[PDB]
């Protein structure tokens, strides 16, 4: 009754001493409190909307203060719950969220909502879903860390989804779609030039539902998905660091998942490992060259593939191949001083092999190894706390191995 | 004396979401000594927060933390002559124990904290070594979320970890169990 | 030095001329490692739609007069470029290569073998279909109609490449449904251009071309 | 009439060196109409000699060729209503006759000039097309260089090549041969 009915009335009539801030905003702003200050029930009020038609009227900052305070107050913690109503509640505010103004807690609204979720059926959140993608379309600037938190919550959903079909089986279409849809909204995103650390959050985005995917099984999909997130790992990663992280990413993520055969492999490992053989930072390298040995590895469920149907990635070639690659790195050292403390890692990595039944693997070279290293470490010396620290890491050792 | 947080597995808001109110409540400015972070932040302000803790941010990112703030990947500490080692766990590619026990030789580091791929929060002692994911400590995941406080002595580490179940306690419970640790 | 743009491109034509020099002189020991670098330049450093158009044309031609490598190289390889060439996102260029991928098995000529094994034909149907295939699948990704039967044409006029290379595994039912296919586009719809003038001057000219 | 110069394998001042003098001689200003020409110049101080030829360098990239003084890939001209096409070759992957006849037919072209890869200098009829390589040209290689001038009456063509033979003559050794031509 005020709210259209003298306010509304008084808002066509009067543009005529207008808003933004003015005290006329601040009244009509306060007045706006009123409830919310008073209330626990402020939810009869997004149905008076002439109010909301009135958001409009207001500036964007104002917008926030309140309807974010409210965001914020609620998320302070939330007063009352859900039916269907709220979730249109929730867009109505969207769609002042999205733009109504322009392209700041929308991260701290994210997570109310990415909270709010888990209890009702798979269309709510479909609904919404699908809002909320695109309402993804009204950025371009605040954006990288803004997607990521729905992704989760899909994927944790997802999970919780995983965790509860037989009545949905549904799942898959579901899935289908989304998985569709988010592939969909997320070439868009690349796309979406726009960034840096486009490639490095995209990635992750990639291994999360991508690993995700390895769990639930859709593998089909896969491949292309994952040719693509090794594009990102060429061209459009670039910086060491980035990469540091990145690749252990990528060989980890590899690492939970299995599906694809050796036959995806023979061209993909060559591949990794010849990216990694195009990396060109030296302590890094080495290290993960013979770490690769791992993916052929006995330990473990990583070193296997499902084009195949199952189990280790039995045969010695390639893993001596990559220690001799590894050694390569060591081989083009010429600075030899990493070279030992390496000598050493590798020598550590030995005792791994010596544990592992590595069974191809014959003596002679590890015999090599230990006394290379011992060759170096004696038998040329300089001005070093290393001298000091070789002694305590060689004495550590030998306890260690047994 | 030594307050120095140990803390895994996050990605606020992310996997974990809030600051759970006890650690709220728990972790005000200057107060705390020291923070070692095992990466994935993922956020920024919460970057801000870190630093909000305790007079120190000692950082080593991670695989699920992108670019840089400004980001030192690894980065080893003494206190005492621990050299007491974090990363998020990143330069992984192998969870097996003789690993493990390699790469606090590599980088020079005795202690390792580390976050996992089926995210971790598990900890033990296996070939005298704590081999440590403090993980899930804010409320993140693959429910404990656990980080310590500790006081290192030396090379020596005591550990009291703090653990905090959600229980129908009402409240975010803390347990705490005191691991003590020698460096080789 | 790190220092350029046209860096890659240049690098790369050097990698080629010498690589293959390499390639007719003998050694090709000291190749892959090379050519795993010259394909990181085509992957990084290379960056422009039309570098790239050039660049690669250069690659698989280079790579076609070499042979050197293996398959063993090869498969590791050969799914990367065409990858890299799946990971290219410029349509006209791309299913024509795609398709044009299935001389890297052919019989037709030396560029088809590997001397890691030493000597001939890269001999085996399964690739090359597969090719075809996914240039079939960048036709299908299409829905861009108009150019998606310049090609299929342009693809049927591959499809009597290979009736006349003995492609043996290669049965008519797709050459059959792509003859169709085109037909069924070309004529069942229809619109104001120039094309449909067009289509049919290659119509005739294919007719009487084809035999 | 029409002096359309076709030129094929250069690489200036690379494979193909010095202009020849003949074709130094030859080349003047304005006087050609149209310049053909089939890429990997290398060189751009030859590309603004390409456009002192005649009013028209009309180009089309090479592979041995980079970047881009502003180069425009392929281009399809029309003189009387023959398509002539030029591309210095690139978009190829195989050097197959039926390949040569259905590429004049994506591009809408009816003649066809390119360049090879062990520099291939040879045009001959084959299924009522020219497929051309006037290649070598300036004195570049996979000794003939040639170029035509060539006089294009509707869709037919009718070229004199003009071939430079190094000889015992003492000279660039100009021997002509027409050729005449029909698109179909």
């Known amino acids: 009754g005020i709210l259209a009915y003298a306010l509304a009335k008084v808002k066509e009539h009067a543009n005529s001493a207008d808003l933004h801030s003015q005290p006329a905003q601040q009244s009509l702003l306060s007045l706006l409190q009123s409830p919310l200050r008073r209330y626990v029930s402020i939810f009869t009020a997004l149905s008076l909307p002439t109010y909301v038609s009135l958001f409009q009227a207001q500036t964007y900052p104002t917008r926030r203060a309140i309807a974010g305070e409210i965001v914020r107050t609620l998320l302070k913690n939330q007063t009352l719950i859900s039916t269907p109503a709220h979730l249109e509640n929730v867009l109505e505010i969207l769609k002042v969220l999205i733009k109504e103004g322009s392209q700041m807690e929308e991260q701290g609204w994210l997570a109310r909502l990415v909270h709010l979720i888990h209890s009702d059926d798979n269309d709510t959140q479909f609904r919404l879903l699908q809002m909320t993608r695109k309402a993804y379309a009204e950025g371009n600037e605040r954006i990288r860390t803004t997607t990521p938190p729905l992704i989760t919550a899909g994927l944790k959903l997802a999970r919780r989804f995983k965790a509860r079909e037989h009545y949905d089986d549904n799942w898959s279409s579901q899935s289908s779609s989304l998985f569709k849809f988010l592939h969909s909204a997320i070439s868009t995103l690349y796309t979406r030039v726009n960034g840096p650390g486009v490639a490095d959050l995209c990635l992750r985005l990639f291994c999360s539902c991508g690993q995700v995917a390895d769990m639930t099984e859709f593998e089909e999909v896969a491949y292309e998905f994952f040719a693509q997130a090794f594009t990102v790992y060429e061209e459009s990663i670039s910086d060491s660091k980035a990469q540091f992280q990145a690749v252990c990413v990528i060989a980890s993520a590899l690492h939970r998942t299995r599906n694809f055969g050796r036959e995806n492999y023979d061209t993909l490992i060559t591949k990794c490992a010849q990216h990694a053989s195009k990396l060109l930072r030296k302590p890094d390298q080495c290290r993960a060259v013979y770490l690769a040995s791992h993916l052929w590895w006995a330990t473990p469920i990583a070193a296997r593939g499902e084009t195949e149907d199952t189990e280790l990635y039995r045969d010695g070639k390639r893993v001596l191949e990559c220690l001799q690659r590894a050694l390569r790195v060591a081989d083009s050292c010429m600075e030899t001083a990493t070279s030992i403390e390496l000598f050493v890692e590798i020598l550590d990595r030995y005792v791994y092999y010596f544990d592992q039944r590595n069974e191809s693997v014959t003596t002679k070279y590890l015999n090599g190894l230990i006394e290379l290293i011992h060759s170096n470490l004696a038998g040329n010396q300089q001005d070093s706390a290393s001298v000091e620290a070789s002694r305590k890491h060689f004495i550590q050792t030998l306890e260690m191995i047994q | ?184």
Request: a negative charge; charged letters at 20%; glycine letters at 8%.
């Open chain 2, 1 to 184: 004396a030594f307050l120095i947080l140990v803390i895994g597995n996050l990605h606020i808001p992310d996997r974990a979401l809030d600051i759970p109110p006890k650690f709220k409540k728990l972790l005000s400015p200057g107060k705390i000594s020291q923070t070692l972070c095992l990466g994935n932040l993922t956020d920024r302000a919460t970057y801000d927060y870190l630093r909000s803790i305790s007079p120190d941010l000692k950082i080593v990112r991670g695989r699920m933390d992108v670019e840089a703030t400004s980001l030192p990947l690894m980065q080893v500490v003494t206190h005492g002559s621990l050299r007491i080692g974090f990363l998020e766990g990143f330069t992984l590619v192998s969870e097996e124990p003789d690993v493990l026990l390699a790469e606090a030789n590599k980088l020079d580091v005795d202690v390792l904290c580390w976050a996992g791929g089926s995210h971790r929060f598990e900890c033990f002692e296996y070939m005298d070594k704590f081999f440590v994911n403090p993980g899930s400590a804010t409320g993140a995941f693959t429910v404990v979320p656990s980080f310590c406080l500790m006081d290192v002595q030396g090379i020596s580490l005591t550990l009291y970890v703090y653990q905090l179940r959600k229980d129908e306690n009402g409240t975010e419970n803390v347990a705490v169990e005191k691991v003590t640790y020698t460096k080789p």
